Design a protein around this nucleic acid. Structure first.
Ligand SMILES: [Mg+2]
Ligand SMILES: [Mg+2]
Length: 174
DNA sequence: GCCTTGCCGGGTAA
DNA sequence: GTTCCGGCGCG
DNA sequence: CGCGCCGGAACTTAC
DNA sequence: CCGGCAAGGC
């Protein structure tokens, strides 16, 4: 159970939130696992109980916080343990098994994919990350390309070929 | 001649 | 998305 | 005194 | 993220 939900959550974190090691007025600190999202409902209904499931399984004692901001809501767990659990998992991403790869790619697409489904695309500034995913998708028989989509901000796009539309949607999304 | 997809500019949602 | 701010508890 | 959870949100920009 | 434009192939 745990590996799949972890990879999915990491997907969301990487793309719509982040992992933060903080240093405050002497000499305090904080370790944060964050996912931000426009919809408070999606955070409470879908994301938070998955995070809560993981927290319980890992015996993390921190609580899930939901903080209102100007433009989005923030799901935040303040936990050194959870922070390293995800940061280490991120470093070892190349060792993911198929269940984890599929969950992670799914997270990526929910967070930052072409949601219109007329085109199948994933955006990110991290080319290296997209190239891992690109390799995974090839082994799943999903052809794709990576190109610099935005010369302003250095944002690359991973475009999934519509020739493999069906296989992508059914393997990754459904 | 239709589809796919590279390219790019605006602008919310991170 | 990121890192500032203000709290608090703990050894 | 040094570190780590809590709650907020101004500030900045990648999708 | 979105979505219009258009250039490149069956
Ligand atoms: Mg992102
Ligand atoms: Mg998003």
């Amino acid at each position: 159970n745990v590996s799949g939900i972890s990879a999915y959550l990491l997907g969301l974190i990487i793309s719509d939130g982040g992992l933060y090691k903080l240093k405050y007025k002497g000499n305090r600190s904080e370790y944060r696992v964050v996912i931000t999202q426009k919809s408070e409902n999606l955070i409470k209904q879908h994301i938070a109980p998955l995070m809560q499931f993981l927290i319980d399984e890992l015996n993390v004692k921190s609580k899930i916080q939901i903080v209102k901001g100007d433009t989005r809501y923030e799901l935040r767990v303040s936990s050194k343990k959870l922070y390293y659990y995800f940061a280490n998992m991120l470093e070892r991403i190349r060792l993911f098994n198929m269940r984890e790869q599929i969950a992670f790619i799914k997270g990526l697409y929910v967070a930052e994919g072409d949601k219109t489904l007329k085109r199948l695309r994933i955006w990110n500034k991290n080319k290296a990350l997209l190239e891992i995913v690109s390799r995974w998708l090839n082994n799943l028989g999903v052809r794709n390309t990576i190109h610099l989509d935005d010369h302003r901000h250095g944002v690359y796009v991973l475009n999934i070929s519509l020739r493999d539309r069906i296989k992508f949607v059914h393997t990754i999304l459904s």
